Amino acid sequence: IMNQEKLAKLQAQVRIGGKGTARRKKKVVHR
Amino acid sequence: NEVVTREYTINIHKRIHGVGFKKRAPRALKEIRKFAMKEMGTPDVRIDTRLNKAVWAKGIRNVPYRIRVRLSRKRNEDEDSPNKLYTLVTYVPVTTFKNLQTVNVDE
Amino acid sequence: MKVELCSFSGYKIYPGHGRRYARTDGKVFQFLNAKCESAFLSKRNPRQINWTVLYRRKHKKG
Amino acid sequence: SMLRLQKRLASSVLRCGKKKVWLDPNETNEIANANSRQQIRKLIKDGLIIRKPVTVHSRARCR
Amino acid sequence: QTKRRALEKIDLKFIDTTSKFGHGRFQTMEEKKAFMGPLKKDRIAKEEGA
Amino acid sequence: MTHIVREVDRPGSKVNKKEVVEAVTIVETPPMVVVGIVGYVETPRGLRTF
RNA sequence: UCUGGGUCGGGGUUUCGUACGUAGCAGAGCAGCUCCCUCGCUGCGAUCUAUUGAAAGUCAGCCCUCGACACAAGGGUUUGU
RNA sequence: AGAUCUUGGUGGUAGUAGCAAAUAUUCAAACGAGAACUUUGAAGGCCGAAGUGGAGAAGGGUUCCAUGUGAACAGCAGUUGA
Ligand SMILES: [Mg+2]
Ligand SMILES: [Mg+2]
Ligand SMILES: [Mg+2]
Ligand SMILES: [Mg+2]
Ligand SMILES: [Mg+2]
Ligand SMILES: [Mg+2]
Ligand SMILES: [Mg+2]
Ligand SMILES: [Mg+2]
Ligand SMILES: [Mg+2]
Ligand SMILES: [Mg+2]
Ligand SMILES: [Mg+2]
C-alpha cells in the first residue's frame, strides 16, 4: 500500500534521468 | 541568518560576452560558481546536475542569456572539513525574466 | 538648419548624415543610412518593407 | 569503486553494447560484489542493472 | 594670431544631438515621440494609469 | 564629439557665405578650485622652486 | 559619509524588422456532408491581414535610476631622522 | 694542454625551446591520504556502416584474464595502465 510519504520519495527514485529516459521498473533486493 | 536561501536571476550573456564558442558553457559554469562565491562567501559551492543540464540545453555555444537560479547555504557540520557552510545552486525554471527581483524565499 | 531631405524610407535626414546617389538618367536620391541604400539597390519596394513611412501610410497605421 | 569488469560482463550478458548498460550509481558496492555472470544475472533479475532503450531515430519526418 | 584662419567670429546655426550609440535619426525625445506616436509599452503604461 | 552646421565668412573661397558641416569635440570643463600658490625664482641652472 | 559600490530589475538609446497563440466570408484550389443548406457547412491548404514599429537583444568597455537584495571599518607584508 | 685526440663525468645555455595535426567537454557521487585525468550516473558532443564498429592473414609471444602495488615507466598526473 502507498501513502503520501512513500509516493513522495518513490517519484524521485523512479526517475533515473532527464525527460525522455526510461523509468526504473524495479529495485528489489534478495538474499 | 546563516542557513538562508535566496532566488537570483543571472545575466549569463553579460558574463560570457567575448569568450570563444567552445568555452561558452564551461565558462558559464565557472562564472556561476564565482557568482555564488561572491554572494554567499562560501568556499564550497555545489552546482545541481539539473542546473548543469539547463545550462547545456542548447549545446556548448548557444548558452542561454538569462538563468533563474536559487542559492541555499547549508551547514557542513556533517564531516571534518575546513569549511562549515556551503551553497547549493538549484535551477528554477521560469517562463519569463521581466520584473524579477532578488527575493528572499523561506526554507 | 539647411534644406531638409527625405530618404528612401521617407525619414528625416539631418545635415551631415547618410549619402546621396546619382543616376545616368539624372535622378538624384538621398538615403539616411546604409540599410536604406542596400534596400534600394536590391530593388525592394518601400511600400512593402514594414518599417518605412510609405508602408505606414498604405496601411493607415497610427 | 571500479566497475569496468562488471560493465563488460553486463554488456556481454544482455546482448547489448556498453552504451546500453546502466549500473545504478547510488548502489555500487553490490555491483562491485558481482564478479561472475551468474551474479550479474541475479542483479539483472533484481533490477540493479537496466538495459537502456535505443536512442530514437524517428522516420515520421521522412514519411 | 594674425592669420584669417584665426580672428574668426563663430556663429553656429545647428548643433547635432542625435544618438551616437548607433545610427540615430532623431534630435530629441520629443521629436521622436511625435514622429512615431504611441507604442505598445506606452499603450500598456497608459492602461495602468488609465 | 559630434558635428556642427554653421556659416562661413571666408572671402575669396569657394565656400564663402556657404554652409559647412564640421566635426567638433566636447570637453567637459567644470570650474576649478584654486588651493595653492607656488613661486619660481630664476637661476643659472634653470628655474627652481622658491 | 550628506553612506558607498555591486547584483538583479526599470526607464532611455540602438539593432533587426512585426514573435507564439488566437481570429478572419483573406487565401491557388482540393477532399467530404445536404431532413439539413437554397447557397450553405466541415476539414487540408503555402501565403496574407488584425492582435504587432510587435518580438527578441541591448555592456560585458552604452546613458540615467533611487526600485529590490545582500554586501561592506576587512585580511596580509614591510617601512624611522 | 692541445692531436675536430680515446673513455668517463660535469657546466652555461636553462627552469629556456618547448609538451599547439585530426571540433569538446561539463555537473554530482563513490573509493582513496591525495582526483582535471579512475569509476558510476546525468548532460553535451564526435567517429557517421569505404567507422574511432565487429572479426581475420602476416607479424608480436603471454601483451589475454583475476587479484594486489603506487618503487621505476606511461615525456603533467593517476586510486589507472599493454
Ligand atoms: Mg556611433
Ligand atoms: Mg539594464
Ligand atoms: Mg703542444
Ligand atoms: Mg676534443
Ligand atoms: Mg616556455
Ligand atoms: Mg605546446
Ligand atoms: Mg550529434
Ligand atoms: Mg556526426
Ligand atoms: Mg576493426
Ligand atoms: Mg608522467
Ligand atoms: Mg590487461
mmCIF file of all heavy atoms in Angstrom, chain B residues 8-46:
data_model
loop_
_atom_site.group_PDB
_atom_site.id
_atom_site.type_symbol
_atom_site.label_atom_id
_atom_site.label_comp_id
_atom_site.label_asym_id
_atom_site.label_seq_id
_atom_site.Cartn_x
_atom_site.Cartn_y
_atom_site.Cartn_z
ATOM 1 N N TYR B 8 17.761 34.161 -7.406
ATOM 2 C CA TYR B 8 18.501 35.076 -8.260
ATOM 3 C C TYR B 8 18.188 34.806 -9.720
ATOM 4 O O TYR B 8 17.769 33.710 -10.094
ATOM 5 C CB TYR B 8 20.010 34.944 -8.077
ATOM 6 C CG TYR B 8 20.522 35.238 -6.697
ATOM 7 C CD1 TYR B 8 20.624 34.236 -5.747
ATOM 8 C CD2 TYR B 8 20.932 36.514 -6.352
ATOM 9 C CE1 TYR B 8 21.108 34.499 -4.489
ATOM 10 C CE2 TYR B 8 21.417 36.787 -5.098
ATOM 11 C CZ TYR B 8 21.502 35.778 -4.170
ATOM 12 O OH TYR B 8 21.989 36.052 -2.917
ATOM 13 N N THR B 9 18.403 35.823 -10.542
ATOM 14 C CA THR B 9 18.483 35.659 -11.981
ATOM 15 C C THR B 9 19.837 36.168 -12.454
ATOM 16 O O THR B 9 20.333 37.196 -11.987
ATOM 17 C CB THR B 9 17.332 36.377 -12.695
ATOM 18 O OG1 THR B 9 17.470 36.219 -14.112
ATOM 19 C CG2 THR B 9 17.288 37.840 -12.339
ATOM 20 N N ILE B 10 20.448 35.419 -13.366
ATOM 21 C CA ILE B 10 21.850 35.595 -13.716
ATOM 22 C C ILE B 10 21.943 36.024 -15.166
ATOM 23 O O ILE B 10 21.427 35.339 -16.055
ATOM 24 C CB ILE B 10 22.657 34.305 -13.496
ATOM 25 C CG1 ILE B 10 22.466 33.811 -12.073
ATOM 26 C CG2 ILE B 10 24.122 34.563 -13.739
ATOM 27 C CD1 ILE B 10 22.765 34.856 -11.071
ATOM 28 N N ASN B 11 22.614 37.147 -15.408
ATOM 29 C CA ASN B 11 22.845 37.611 -16.769
ATOM 30 C C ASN B 11 24.068 36.880 -17.306
ATOM 31 O O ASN B 11 25.184 37.400 -17.348
ATOM 32 C CB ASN B 11 23.013 39.120 -16.805
ATOM 33 C CG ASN B 11 22.439 39.729 -18.055
ATOM 34 O OD1 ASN B 11 22.603 39.194 -19.149
ATOM 35 N ND2 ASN B 11 21.743 40.847 -17.901
ATOM 36 N N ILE B 12 23.838 35.630 -17.709
ATOM 37 C CA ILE B 12 24.896 34.817 -18.300
ATOM 38 C C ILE B 12 25.445 35.486 -19.551
ATOM 39 O O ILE B 12 26.655 35.469 -19.797
ATOM 40 C CB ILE B 12 24.369 33.399 -18.589
ATOM 41 C CG1 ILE B 12 24.266 32.600 -17.293
ATOM 42 C CG2 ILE B 12 25.265 32.669 -19.566
ATOM 43 C CD1 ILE B 12 25.546 32.590 -16.494
ATOM 44 N N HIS B 13 24.569 36.093 -20.354
ATOM 45 C CA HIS B 13 25.026 36.831 -21.526
ATOM 46 C C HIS B 13 26.021 37.916 -21.148
ATOM 47 O O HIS B 13 26.991 38.151 -21.874
ATOM 48 C CB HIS B 13 23.833 37.442 -22.256
ATOM 49 C CG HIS B 13 24.140 37.893 -23.648
ATOM 50 N ND1 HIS B 13 23.341 38.779 -24.336
ATOM 51 C CD2 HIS B 13 25.160 37.583 -24.481
ATOM 52 C CE1 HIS B 13 23.854 38.994 -25.534
ATOM 53 N NE2 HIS B 13 24.958 38.279 -25.648
ATOM 54 N N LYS B 14 25.804 38.573 -20.011
ATOM 55 C CA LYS B 14 26.719 39.606 -19.548
ATOM 56 C C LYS B 14 28.089 39.037 -19.204
ATOM 57 O O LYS B 14 29.114 39.636 -19.544
ATOM 58 C CB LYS B 14 26.120 40.317 -18.338
ATOM 59 C CG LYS B 14 26.898 41.516 -17.872
ATOM 60 C CD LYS B 14 26.265 42.113 -16.636
ATOM 61 C CE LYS B 14 26.945 41.620 -15.376
ATOM 62 N NZ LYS B 14 26.799 42.591 -14.254
ATOM 63 N N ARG B 15 28.130 37.886 -18.539
ATOM 64 C CA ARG B 15 29.384 37.332 -18.049
ATOM 65 C C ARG B 15 30.087 36.443 -19.061
ATOM 66 O O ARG B 15 31.241 36.069 -18.838
ATOM 67 C CB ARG B 15 29.140 36.534 -16.768
ATOM 68 C CG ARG B 15 28.693 37.379 -15.596
ATOM 69 C CD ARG B 15 28.244 36.513 -14.440
ATOM 70 N NE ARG B 15 27.934 37.309 -13.261
ATOM 71 C CZ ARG B 15 26.792 37.954 -13.081
ATOM 72 N NH1 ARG B 15 25.817 37.891 -13.971
ATOM 73 N NH2 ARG B 15 26.620 38.676 -11.978
ATOM 74 N N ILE B 16 29.426 36.102 -20.161
ATOM 75 C CA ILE B 16 30.003 35.243 -21.187
ATOM 76 C C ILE B 16 30.572 36.035 -22.350
ATOM 77 O O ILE B 16 31.552 35.583 -22.968
ATOM 78 C CB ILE B 16 28.967 34.207 -21.682
ATOM 79 C CG1 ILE B 16 28.697 33.183 -20.586
ATOM 80 C CG2 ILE B 16 29.412 33.473 -22.923
ATOM 81 C CD1 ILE B 16 29.947 32.677 -19.925
ATOM 82 N N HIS B 17 30.052 37.235 -22.609
ATOM 83 C CA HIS B 17 30.374 38.029 -23.788
ATOM 84 C C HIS B 17 31.872 38.162 -24.023
ATOM 85 O O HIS B 17 32.590 38.728 -23.195
ATOM 86 C CB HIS B 17 29.752 39.417 -23.664
ATOM 87 C CG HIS B 17 30.140 40.345 -24.767
ATOM 88 N ND1 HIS B 17 31.235 41.177 -24.688
ATOM 89 C CD2 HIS B 17 29.586 40.566 -25.981
ATOM 90 C CE1 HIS B 17 31.336 41.873 -25.805
ATOM 91 N NE2 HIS B 17 30.347 41.522 -26.606
ATOM 92 N N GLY B 18 32.345 37.629 -25.146
ATOM 93 C CA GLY B 18 33.738 37.710 -25.540
ATOM 94 C C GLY B 18 34.457 36.380 -25.601
ATOM 95 O O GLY B 18 35.451 36.262 -26.329
ATOM 96 N N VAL B 19 33.994 35.374 -24.874
ATOM 97 C CA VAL B 19 34.683 34.094 -24.822
ATOM 98 C C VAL B 19 34.366 33.305 -26.088
ATOM 99 O O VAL B 19 33.347 33.522 -26.747
ATOM 100 C CB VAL B 19 34.306 33.311 -23.545
ATOM 101 C CG1 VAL B 19 32.930 32.712 -23.669
ATOM 102 C CG2 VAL B 19 35.341 32.239 -23.224
ATOM 103 N N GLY B 20 35.261 32.389 -26.441
ATOM 104 C CA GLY B 20 35.120 31.626 -27.667
ATOM 105 C C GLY B 20 33.947 30.666 -27.621
ATOM 106 O O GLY B 20 33.314 30.443 -26.591
ATOM 107 N N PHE B 21 33.656 30.088 -28.790
ATOM 108 C CA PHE B 21 32.495 29.213 -28.923
ATOM 109 C C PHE B 21 32.569 28.024 -27.982
ATOM 110 O O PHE B 21 31.649 27.785 -27.194
ATOM 111 C CB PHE B 21 32.372 28.705 -30.356
ATOM 112 C CG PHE B 21 31.688 29.653 -31.280
ATOM 113 C CD1 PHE B 21 31.700 29.427 -32.644
ATOM 114 C CD2 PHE B 21 31.006 30.748 -30.790
ATOM 115 C CE1 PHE B 21 31.066 30.285 -33.501
ATOM 116 C CE2 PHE B 21 30.371 31.614 -31.645
ATOM 117 C CZ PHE B 21 30.400 31.383 -33.003
ATOM 118 N N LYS B 22 33.664 27.282 -28.031
ATOM 119 C CA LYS B 22 33.748 26.015 -27.325
ATOM 120 C C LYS B 22 34.133 26.182 -25.867
ATOM 121 O O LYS B 22 34.427 25.188 -25.197
ATOM 122 C CB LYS B 22 34.729 25.094 -28.044
ATOM 123 C CG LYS B 22 34.036 24.303 -29.123
ATOM 124 C CD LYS B 22 34.979 23.885 -30.211
ATOM 125 C CE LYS B 22 34.197 23.336 -31.380
ATOM 126 N NZ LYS B 22 35.007 23.393 -32.621
ATOM 127 N N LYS B 23 34.136 27.410 -25.367
ATOM 128 C CA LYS B 23 34.331 27.677 -23.955
ATOM 129 C C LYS B 23 33.132 28.359 -23.318
ATOM 130 O O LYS B 23 33.176 28.652 -22.124
ATOM 131 C CB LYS B 23 35.578 28.540 -23.753
ATOM 132 C CG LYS B 23 36.879 27.842 -24.087
ATOM 133 C CD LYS B 23 38.054 28.769 -23.845
ATOM 134 C CE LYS B 23 39.370 28.105 -24.198
ATOM 135 N NZ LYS B 23 39.703 27.018 -23.240
ATOM 136 N N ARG B 24 32.064 28.615 -24.077
ATOM 137 C CA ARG B 24 30.967 29.430 -23.565
ATOM 138 C C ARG B 24 30.254 28.752 -22.400
ATOM 139 O O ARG B 24 29.989 29.382 -21.371
ATOM 140 C CB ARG B 24 29.986 29.747 -24.689
ATOM 141 C CG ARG B 24 30.403 30.938 -25.515
ATOM 142 C CD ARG B 24 29.506 31.143 -26.705
ATOM 143 N NE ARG B 24 28.398 32.037 -26.397
ATOM 144 C CZ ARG B 24 28.502 33.355 -26.297
ATOM 145 N NH1 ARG B 24 29.652 33.975 -26.497
ATOM 146 N NH2 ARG B 24 27.424 34.068 -25.990
ATOM 147 N N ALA B 25 29.931 27.466 -22.543
ATOM 148 C CA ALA B 25 29.218 26.779 -21.467
ATOM 149 C C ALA B 25 30.116 26.445 -20.280
ATOM 150 O O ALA B 25 29.690 26.675 -19.133
ATOM 151 C CB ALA B 25 28.509 25.540 -22.020
ATOM 152 N N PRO B 26 31.326 25.886 -20.451
ATOM 153 C CA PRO B 26 32.183 25.695 -19.268
ATOM 154 C C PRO B 26 32.528 26.991 -18.554
ATOM 155 O O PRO B 26 32.534 27.029 -17.316
ATOM 156 C CB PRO B 26 33.425 25.009 -19.848
ATOM 157 C CG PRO B 26 32.942 24.344 -21.071
ATOM 158 C CD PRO B 26 31.945 25.284 -21.646
ATOM 159 N N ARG B 27 32.791 28.068 -19.295
ATOM 160 C CA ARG B 27 32.995 29.350 -18.635
ATOM 161 C C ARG B 27 31.724 29.822 -17.953
ATOM 162 O O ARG B 27 31.795 30.494 -16.927
ATOM 163 C CB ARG B 27 33.486 30.406 -19.622
ATOM 164 C CG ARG B 27 33.912 31.709 -18.965
ATOM 165 C CD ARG B 27 35.423 31.820 -18.861
ATOM 166 N NE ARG B 27 35.824 32.853 -17.914
ATOM 167 C CZ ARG B 27 36.962 32.843 -17.235
ATOM 168 N NH1 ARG B 27 37.855 31.883 -17.399
ATOM 169 N NH2 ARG B 27 37.209 33.820 -16.367
ATOM 170 N N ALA B 28 30.555 29.474 -18.493
ATOM 171 C CA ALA B 28 29.314 29.796 -17.797
ATOM 172 C C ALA B 28 29.246 29.084 -16.454
ATOM 173 O O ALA B 28 28.807 29.665 -15.454
ATOM 174 C CB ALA B 28 28.110 29.434 -18.662
ATOM 175 N N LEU B 29 29.686 27.825 -16.411
ATOM 176 C CA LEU B 29 29.755 27.113 -15.139
ATOM 177 C C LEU B 29 30.718 27.799 -14.176
ATOM 178 O O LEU B 29 30.410 27.981 -12.992
ATOM 179 C CB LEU B 29 30.170 25.661 -15.371
ATOM 180 C CG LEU B 29 29.048 24.635 -15.533
ATOM 181 C CD1 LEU B 29 28.206 24.565 -14.273
ATOM 182 C CD2 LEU B 29 28.183 24.938 -16.741
ATOM 183 N N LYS B 30 31.891 28.198 -14.669
ATOM 184 C CA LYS B 30 32.847 28.879 -13.798
ATOM 185 C C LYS B 30 32.279 30.193 -13.276
ATOM 186 O O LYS B 30 32.449 30.532 -12.102
ATOM 187 C CB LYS B 30 34.173 29.124 -14.518
ATOM 188 C CG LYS B 30 34.693 27.949 -15.307
ATOM 189 C CD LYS B 30 35.095 26.804 -14.400
ATOM 190 C CE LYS B 30 35.870 25.746 -15.168
ATOM 191 N NZ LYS B 30 34.979 24.888 -16.002
ATOM 192 N N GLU B 31 31.591 30.944 -14.132
ATOM 193 C CA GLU B 31 31.074 32.235 -13.700
ATOM 194 C C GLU B 31 29.899 32.091 -12.747
ATOM 195 O O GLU B 31 29.737 32.927 -11.858
ATOM 196 C CB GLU B 31 30.688 33.099 -14.899
ATOM 197 C CG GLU B 31 31.813 33.337 -15.892
ATOM 198 C CD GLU B 31 32.794 34.409 -15.455
ATOM 199 O OE1 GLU B 31 32.793 34.789 -14.266
ATOM 200 O OE2 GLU B 31 33.579 34.870 -16.309
ATOM 201 N N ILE B 32 29.075 31.051 -12.890
ATOM 202 C CA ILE B 32 28.036 30.869 -11.879
ATOM 203 C C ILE B 32 28.655 30.418 -10.558
ATOM 204 O O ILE B 32 28.188 30.816 -9.476
ATOM 205 C CB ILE B 32 26.925 29.920 -12.374
ATOM 206 C CG1 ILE B 32 25.736 29.962 -11.420
ATOM 207 C CG2 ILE B 32 27.403 28.500 -12.514
ATOM 208 C CD1 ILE B 32 25.073 31.305 -11.353
ATOM 209 N N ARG B 33 29.735 29.629 -10.614
ATOM 210 C CA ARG B 33 30.454 29.287 -9.391
ATOM 211 C C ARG B 33 30.985 30.535 -8.702
ATOM 212 O O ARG B 33 30.814 30.706 -7.493
ATOM 213 C CB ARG B 33 31.600 28.322 -9.694
ATOM 214 C CG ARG B 33 31.171 26.921 -10.081
ATOM 215 C CD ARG B 33 32.203 25.882 -9.659
ATOM 216 N NE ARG B 33 32.286 25.731 -8.210
ATOM 217 C CZ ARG B 33 33.201 26.302 -7.437
ATOM 218 N NH1 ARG B 33 34.147 27.076 -7.941
ATOM 219 N NH2 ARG B 33 33.163 26.092 -6.125
ATOM 220 N N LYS B 34 31.616 31.431 -9.462
ATOM 221 C CA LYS B 34 32.130 32.670 -8.884
ATOM 222 C C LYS B 34 31.021 33.611 -8.436
ATOM 223 O O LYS B 34 31.212 34.361 -7.471
ATOM 224 C CB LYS B 34 33.053 33.385 -9.868
ATOM 225 C CG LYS B 34 34.509 32.967 -9.761
ATOM 226 C CD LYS B 34 34.751 31.575 -10.301
ATOM 227 C CE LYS B 34 36.217 31.204 -10.255
ATOM 228 N NZ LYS B 34 36.431 29.790 -10.664
ATOM 229 N N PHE B 35 29.868 33.585 -9.104
ATOM 230 C CA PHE B 35 28.720 34.340 -8.622
ATOM 231 C C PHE B 35 28.329 33.894 -7.223
ATOM 232 O O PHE B 35 28.185 34.718 -6.314
ATOM 233 C CB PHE B 35 27.533 34.164 -9.561
ATOM 234 C CG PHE B 35 26.287 34.796 -9.047
ATOM 235 C CD1 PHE B 35 26.165 36.167 -9.012
ATOM 236 C CD2 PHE B 35 25.274 34.024 -8.519
ATOM 237 C CE1 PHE B 35 25.033 36.757 -8.518
ATOM 238 C CE2 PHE B 35 24.146 34.608 -8.006
ATOM 239 C CZ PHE B 35 24.021 35.977 -8.013
ATOM 240 N N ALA B 36 28.140 32.585 -7.038
ATOM 241 C CA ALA B 36 27.781 32.081 -5.716
ATOM 242 C C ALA B 36 28.893 32.344 -4.709
ATOM 243 O O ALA B 36 28.625 32.640 -3.537
ATOM 244 C CB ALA B 36 27.458 30.590 -5.788
ATOM 245 N N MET B 37 30.147 32.240 -5.157
ATOM 246 C CA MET B 37 31.305 32.558 -4.329
ATOM 247 C C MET B 37 31.194 33.960 -3.749
ATOM 248 O O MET B 37 31.326 34.162 -2.538
ATOM 249 C CB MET B 37 32.580 32.438 -5.167
ATOM 250 C CG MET B 37 33.107 31.034 -5.388
ATOM 251 S SD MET B 37 33.307 30.075 -3.891
ATOM 252 C CE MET B 37 34.562 31.043 -3.063
ATOM 253 N N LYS B 38 30.947 34.947 -4.608
ATOM 254 C CA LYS B 38 30.884 36.318 -4.124
ATOM 255 C C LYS B 38 29.555 36.643 -3.460
ATOM 256 O O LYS B 38 29.468 37.647 -2.747
ATOM 257 C CB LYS B 38 31.173 37.301 -5.268
ATOM 258 C CG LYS B 38 30.152 37.346 -6.397
ATOM 259 C CD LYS B 38 29.108 38.438 -6.183
ATOM 260 C CE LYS B 38 28.172 38.552 -7.371
ATOM 261 N NZ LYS B 38 27.141 39.605 -7.171
ATOM 262 N N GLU B 39 28.525 35.828 -3.669
ATOM 263 C CA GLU B 39 27.258 36.082 -3.000
ATOM 264 C C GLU B 39 27.277 35.570 -1.568
ATOM 265 O O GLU B 39 27.165 36.349 -0.618
ATOM 266 C CB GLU B 39 26.109 35.443 -3.781
ATOM 267 C CG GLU B 39 25.475 36.358 -4.802
ATOM 268 C CD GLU B 39 25.037 37.677 -4.202
ATOM 269 O OE1 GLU B 39 24.470 37.667 -3.088
ATOM 270 O OE2 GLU B 39 25.263 38.727 -4.839
ATOM 271 N N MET B 40 27.435 34.263 -1.392
ATOM 272 C CA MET B 40 27.321 33.686 -0.062
ATOM 273 C C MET B 40 28.644 33.643 0.686
ATOM 274 O O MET B 40 28.653 33.312 1.876
ATOM 275 C CB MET B 40 26.737 32.276 -0.153
ATOM 276 C CG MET B 40 25.496 32.191 -1.019
ATOM 277 S SD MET B 40 24.144 33.255 -0.484
ATOM 278 C CE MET B 40 23.586 32.387 0.975
ATOM 279 N N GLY B 41 29.753 33.966 0.026
ATOM 280 C CA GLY B 41 31.050 33.889 0.668
ATOM 281 C C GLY B 41 31.465 32.493 1.055
ATOM 282 O O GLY B 41 32.381 32.330 1.862
ATOM 283 N N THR B 42 30.818 31.472 0.497
ATOM 284 C CA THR B 42 31.088 30.098 0.882
ATOM 285 C C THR B 42 32.131 29.508 -0.050
ATOM 286 O O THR B 42 31.872 29.394 -1.257
ATOM 287 C CB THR B 42 29.808 29.266 0.841
ATOM 288 O OG1 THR B 42 29.274 29.267 -0.487
ATOM 289 C CG2 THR B 42 28.777 29.842 1.791
ATOM 290 N N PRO B 43 33.312 29.135 0.445
ATOM 291 C CA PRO B 43 34.309 28.492 -0.427
ATOM 292 C C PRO B 43 33.811 27.224 -1.095
ATOM 293 O O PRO B 43 34.229 26.932 -2.221
ATOM 294 C CB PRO B 43 35.470 28.198 0.530
ATOM 295 C CG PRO B 43 35.323 29.206 1.614
ATOM 296 C CD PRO B 43 33.858 29.458 1.774
ATOM 297 N N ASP B 44 32.938 26.462 -0.443
ATOM 298 C CA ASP B 44 32.354 25.265 -1.034
ATOM 299 C C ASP B 44 31.070 25.666 -1.746
ATOM 300 O O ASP B 44 30.127 26.153 -1.116
ATOM 301 C CB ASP B 44 32.078 24.208 0.031
ATOM 302 C CG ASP B 44 33.343 23.641 0.633
ATOM 303 O OD1 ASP B 44 34.375 23.599 -0.067
ATOM 304 O OD2 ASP B 44 33.306 23.232 1.812
ATOM 305 N N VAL B 45 31.037 25.477 -3.059
ATOM 306 C CA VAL B 45 29.857 25.760 -3.861
ATOM 307 C C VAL B 45 29.563 24.538 -4.711
ATOM 308 O O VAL B 45 30.433 24.068 -5.451
ATOM 309 C CB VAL B 45 30.051 27.001 -4.747
ATOM 310 C CG1 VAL B 45 28.926 27.104 -5.754
ATOM 311 C CG2 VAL B 45 30.115 28.248 -3.887
ATOM 312 N N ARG B 46 28.345 24.024 -4.605
ATOM 313 C CA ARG B 46 27.927 22.850 -5.349
ATOM 314 C C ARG B 46 26.816 23.218 -6.318
ATOM 315 O O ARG B 46 25.842 23.875 -5.943
ATOM 316 C CB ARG B 46 27.457 21.744 -4.409
ATOM 317 C CG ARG B 46 28.451 20.618 -4.274
ATOM 318 C CD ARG B 46 27.887 19.492 -3.447
ATOM 319 N NE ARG B 46 27.526 19.917 -2.101
ATOM 320 C CZ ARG B 46 28.366 19.941 -1.077
ATOM 321 N NH1 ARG B 46 29.640 19.622 -1.220
ATOM 322 N NH2 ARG B 46 27.915 20.283 0.123
#
